[PDB]
Design a protein around this motif. Structure first.
Motif, PDB file in Angstrom:
ATOM      1  N   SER A   1      -3.121   1.565 -10.568  1.00 29.85           N
ATOM      2  CA  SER A   1      -4.384   1.798 -11.267  1.00 29.85           C
ATOM      3  C   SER A   1      -5.461   2.049 -10.212  1.00 29.85           C
ATOM      4  CB  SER A   1      -4.737   0.649 -12.213  1.00 29.85           C
ATOM      5  OG  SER A   1      -4.687  -0.597 -11.537  1.00 29.85           O
ATOM      6  N   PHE A   2      -5.917   3.303 -10.108  1.00 28.69           N
ATOM      7  CA  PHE A   2      -6.973   3.633  -9.160  1.00 28.69           C
ATOM      8  C   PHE A   2      -8.314   3.313  -9.789  1.00 28.69           C
ATOM      9  CE2 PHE A   2      -3.488   6.536  -7.794  1.00 28.69           C
ATOM     10  CZ  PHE A   2      -3.430   6.243  -6.442  1.00 28.69           C
ATOM     11  N   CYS A   3      -9.145   2.544  -9.089  1.00 30.34           N
ATOM     12  CA  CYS A   3     -10.422   2.136  -9.675  1.00 30.34           C
ATOM     13  C   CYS A   3     -11.621   2.439  -8.805  1.00 30.34           C
ATOM     14  CB  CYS A   3     -10.463   0.638  -9.992  1.00 30.34           C
ATOM     15  SG  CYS A   3     -10.078  -0.388  -8.587  1.00 30.34           S
ATOM     16  N   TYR A   4     -11.426   2.876  -7.559  1.00 26.39           N
ATOM     17  CA  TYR A   4     -12.562   3.081  -6.667  1.00 26.39           C
ATOM     18  C   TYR A   4     -12.251   4.215  -5.697  1.00 26.39           C
ATOM     19  CZ  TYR A   4     -16.121   2.166  -3.089  1.00 26.39           C
ATOM     20  OH  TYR A   4     -17.156   2.247  -2.198  1.00 26.39           O
ATOM     21  N   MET A   5     -13.245   5.069  -5.450  1.00 30.29           N
ATOM     22  CA  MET A   5     -13.170   6.018  -4.348  1.00 30.29           C
ATOM     23  C   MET A   5     -14.431   5.850  -3.527  1.00 30.29           C
ATOM     24  SD  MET A   5     -12.445  10.146  -4.155  1.00 30.29           S
ATOM     25  CE  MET A   5     -10.663   9.953  -3.814  1.00 30.29           C
ATOM     26  N   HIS A   6     -14.249   5.678  -2.223  1.00 33.38           N
ATOM     27  CA  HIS A   6     -15.344   5.342  -1.354  1.00 33.38           C
ATOM     28  C   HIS A   6     -16.207   6.574  -1.032  1.00 33.38           C
ATOM     29  CE1 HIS A   6     -17.846   3.334   1.329  1.00 33.38           C
ATOM     30  NE2 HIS A   6     -17.463   4.025   2.385  1.00 33.38           N
ATOM     31  N   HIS A   7     -17.543   6.396  -1.061  1.00 29.43           N
ATOM     32  CA  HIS A   7     -18.450   7.464  -0.661  1.00 29.43           C
ATOM     33  C   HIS A   7     -19.387   7.060   0.465  1.00 29.43           C
ATOM     34  CE1 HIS A   7     -18.035  10.265  -4.300  1.00 29.43           C
ATOM     35  NE2 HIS A   7     -17.216   9.250  -4.521  1.00 29.43           N
ATOM     36  N   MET A   8     -20.127   5.974   0.262  1.00 29.41           N
ATOM     37  CA  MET A   8     -21.216   5.727   1.226  1.00 29.41           C
ATOM     38  C   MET A   8     -21.480   4.280   1.620  1.00 29.41           C
ATOM     39  SD  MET A   8     -23.864   6.954  -1.552  1.00 29.41           S
ATOM     40  CE  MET A   8     -23.349   8.424  -0.668  1.00 29.41           C
TER      41      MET A   8
ATOM     42  N   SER B   1       0.794  -1.226   0.000  1.00 31.77           N
ATOM     43  CA  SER B   1       0.000   0.000   0.000  1.00 31.77           C
ATOM     44  C   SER B   1       0.833   1.286   0.000  1.00 31.77           C
ATOM     45  CB  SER B   1      -0.951  -0.006   1.205  1.00 31.77           C
ATOM     46  OG  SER B   1      -0.252  -0.067   2.461  1.00 31.77           O
ATOM     47  N   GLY B   2       2.164   1.179   0.081  1.00 29.21           N
ATOM     48  CA  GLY B   2       2.990   2.367   0.263  1.00 29.21           C
ATOM     49  C   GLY B   2       2.784   3.421  -0.814  1.00 29.21           C
TER      50      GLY B   2
ATOM     51  N   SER C   1      -7.392  -3.782  -4.177  1.00 24.51           N
ATOM     52  CA  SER C   1      -7.020  -3.516  -2.787  1.00 24.51           C
ATOM     53  C   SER C   1      -7.642  -2.198  -2.350  1.00 24.51           C
ATOM     54  CB  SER C   1      -5.511  -3.392  -2.654  1.00 24.51           C
ATOM     55  OG  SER C   1      -4.879  -4.587  -3.170  1.00 24.51           O
ATOM     56  N   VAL C   2      -8.060  -2.151  -1.095  1.00 24.51           N
ATOM     57  CA  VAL C   2      -8.595  -0.939  -0.474  1.00 24.51           C
ATOM     58  C   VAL C   2      -7.640  -0.516   0.633  1.00 24.51           C
ATOM     59  CG1 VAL C   2     -10.472   0.070   0.975  1.00 24.51           C
ATOM     60  CG2 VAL C   2     -10.980  -1.501  -1.065  1.00 24.51           C
TER      61      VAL C   2
ATOM     62  N   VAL D   1      -9.433   4.869  -1.204  1.00 28.57           N
ATOM     63  CA  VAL D   1      -9.455   4.410  -2.594  1.00 28.57           C
ATOM     64  C   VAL D   1      -9.167   2.918  -2.692  1.00 28.57           C
ATOM     65  CG1 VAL D   1      -8.966   6.665  -3.591  1.00 28.57           C
ATOM     66  CG2 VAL D   1      -7.020   5.189  -3.004  1.00 28.57           C
ATOM     67  N   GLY D   2      -9.620   2.344  -3.818  1.00 31.55           N
ATOM     68  CA  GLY D   2      -9.281   0.995  -4.217  1.00 31.55           C
ATOM     69  C   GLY D   2      -8.372   1.063  -5.428  1.00 31.55           C
ATOM     70  N   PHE D   3      -7.483   0.079  -5.542  1.00 27.45           N
ATOM     71  CA  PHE D   3      -6.443   0.168  -6.541  1.00 27.45           C
ATOM     72  C   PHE D   3      -5.837  -1.207  -6.798  1.00 27.45           C
ATOM     73  CE2 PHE D   3      -2.979  -0.537  -3.556  1.00 27.45           C
ATOM     74  CZ  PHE D   3      -3.554  -0.164  -2.341  1.00 27.45           C
ATOM     75  N   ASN D   4      -5.203  -1.338  -7.967  1.00 26.70           N
ATOM     76  CA  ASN D   4      -4.311  -2.462  -8.227  1.00 26.70           C
ATOM     77  C   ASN D   4      -2.940  -1.914  -8.575  1.00 26.70           C
ATOM     78  OD1 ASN D   4      -5.952  -5.037  -8.140  1.00 26.70           O
ATOM     79  ND2 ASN D   4      -7.237  -3.710  -9.391  1.00 26.70           N
ATOM     80  N   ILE D   5      -1.899  -2.729  -8.379  1.00 24.40           N
ATOM     81  CA  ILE D   5      -0.583  -2.277  -8.794  1.00 24.40           C
ATOM     82  C   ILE D   5       0.066  -3.431  -9.530  1.00 24.40           C
ATOM     83  CG2 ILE D   5       1.571  -1.114  -8.156  1.00 24.40           C
ATOM     84  CD1 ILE D   5       0.412  -0.419  -5.424  1.00 24.40           C
ATOM     85  N   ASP D   6      -0.413  -3.701 -10.713  1.00 30.78           N
ATOM     86  CA  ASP D   6       0.199  -4.697 -11.561  1.00 30.78           C
ATOM     87  C   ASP D   6       1.375  -3.973 -12.197  1.00 30.78           C
ATOM     88  OD1 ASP D   6      -1.985  -6.689 -11.066  1.00 30.78           O
ATOM     89  OD2 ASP D   6      -3.175  -5.435 -12.449  1.00 30.78           O
TER      90      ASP D   6
END
Ligand SMILES: NC(=O)CC[C@H](N)C(=O)O
Lengths: 8, 301, 299
Positions: B158-165, B10-11, B113-114, B148-153
């Motif tokens: 690659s950011f794919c999600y931002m949390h709201h509710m 996650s760094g 990953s979150v 945020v959610g992300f992958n690091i291939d």
């Protein structure tokens, strides 16, 4: 029952 | 050997997390280059969260109404705009820790990953999947919005999600990094419900392949099936339909194990009808559906 | 809401991982201050002491695209300590700790000095860990974050024939009855970490999953008599004390919850799930439940 998850 | 719900380190994301405050409302922001991305609900007042007019709310704000803190350092906001459900705060400093990154909108069944954060600081990292009903089964409390959610291939985040509710069933809804919600959800506290969720069939099959790769074959059987017959059975257990695309995607795992895709489908049909009868697969007593075919290849030999 | 297997944020540890190569063996090293820690098997009945007649230049240490200059080497138990000429500018506040069975930690799985994934693991009662590791992962490390301090507790060495894993603390002492040589070794009979199961039942109650609560309570002695018969670790009064917060926060006294767990062991789950699991999860500690359900952060 929908909640923003900011903080106040 | 072994098989775990494995998140990306996650760094690279930790170094992007900041705290954003507007009035009495605080959440997390994502500081990339000279822009801070965060949910636009940070500009709402506690009173009007049912039907906020975000355009009206945003035009009443000055740059100096946004308090952005990276660690103990306050960042100066020099501009702001709204893109769909995300606010973009321009700041006078580019984040020196900005990784190589891109924004991607993912499809249901995809994992990521979150990095769950509060007040701009990380609490923990875990794996999640985009459910078929466009919710995610996260672990989030008040103040986690903007995580945020992300992958690091490879080398790229690659950011794919931002949390709201959080929805009333306790699952979660959010956006891509362009501010478009996944699913039919809106950034309002009006009544919203997730549709019925289903099981991600291609992921279950990928995970059975991971089980065979790790040396477990007890659930295989001698049978094969047709694609359409499998889908008729799978629907009866609220499983997602398996498409020929999914079959193609499983080709590699099929070759590595010598078990044809439709042979593995017949084994899944039998597992749905019999259960595990006190046995486990990869340490689980139920059928796991948050590992993709790509995840299995990433983790396994 | 929600409850996931949650690892600590790994950024502080990622900046410490390096690649260590000796001859044809490559594994991972942990670069802290001006020392790189790695398994002594990197120099490989091996006479490791007799084998370290190599020069400092025999050990190639690469941090990203930079080669670290080794200026000394010594061995401590099963760990090699490579002295280098540069202190790691990314060294976090840290210490070495030896954990007890039942304690959990995050594993930063690495290959060729590069972090590849992070997950939560428990030290099993039989001193193995149920990890996910491939060839090249030796030297990956396990850690917790206490407040601001990274407590390193595990260095990965090897895989046993059942596919579980064995390693050392950062002073090179093995967890469990294991040795770092190719000899016949097996994981002992494992048991379930009772206090962790109870912690997870509290997490379940916090998340509104309550079907297993019952009217019954029990004593520590009565519970342990039944639990030992199902290969559960004994529950001590220390464990009861540690669960005190969760017992208060949920209104289920530990011994009240113990009666719920007592019933789950003898009767099974009767087809239901708890927190999305059909078995009794035992790799969350009481602190793990508190940190996740109260949003504790690390800075
Ligand atoms: N899968 C394993 O844990 C084997 C690791 C091997 N001993 C090196 O690296």
């Amino acid at each position: 029952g929908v909640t923003f998850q900011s903080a106040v | 050997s072994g098989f775990r719900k494995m998140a990306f380190p996650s760094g690279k994301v930790e170094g992007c997390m900041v705290q954003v405050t507007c009035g009495t409302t605080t959440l997390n922001g994502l500081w990339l280059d000279d822009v801070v991305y965060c949910p636009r609900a940070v500009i709402c007042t506690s009173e009007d969260m049912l039907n906020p007019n975000y355009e009206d709310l945003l035009i009443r704000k000055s740059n100096h109404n946004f308090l952005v803190q990276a660690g103990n350092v306050q960042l100066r906001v020099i501009g702001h705009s709204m893109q769909n459900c995300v606010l973009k705060l321009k700041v006078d400093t580019a984040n020196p820790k900005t990784p190589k990154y891109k924004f991607v909108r993912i499809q249901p069944g995809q994992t990521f990953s979150v990095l769950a954060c509060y007040n701009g600081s990380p609490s923990g990292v875990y794996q999640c999947a985009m459910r078929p009903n466009f919710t995610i089964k996260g672990s989030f409390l008040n103040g986690s919005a903007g995580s945020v959610g992300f992958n690091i291939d490879y080398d790229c985040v690659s950011f794919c999600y931002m949390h709201h509710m959080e929805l009333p069933t306790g699952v979660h809804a959010g956006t891509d990094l362009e501010g478009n919600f996944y699913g039919p959800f809106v950034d309002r506290q009006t009544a919203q419900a997730a549709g019925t969720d289903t099981t991600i069939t291609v992921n279950v099959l990928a995970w059975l392949y991971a089980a065979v790769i790790n040396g477990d074959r007890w659930f295989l059987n001698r049978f094969t099936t047709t694609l359409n017959d499998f889908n008729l059975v799978a629907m009866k257990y609220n499983y997602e339909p398996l498409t020929q695309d999914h079959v193609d995607i499983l080709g590699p795992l099929s070759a590595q194990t010598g078990i044809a895709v439709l042979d593995m489908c017949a084994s899944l049909k039998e597992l749905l009808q019999n259960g595990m009868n006190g046995r486990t697969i990869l340490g689980s007593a139920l059928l796991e559906d948050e590992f993709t075919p790509f995840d299995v290849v990433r983790q396994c030999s």
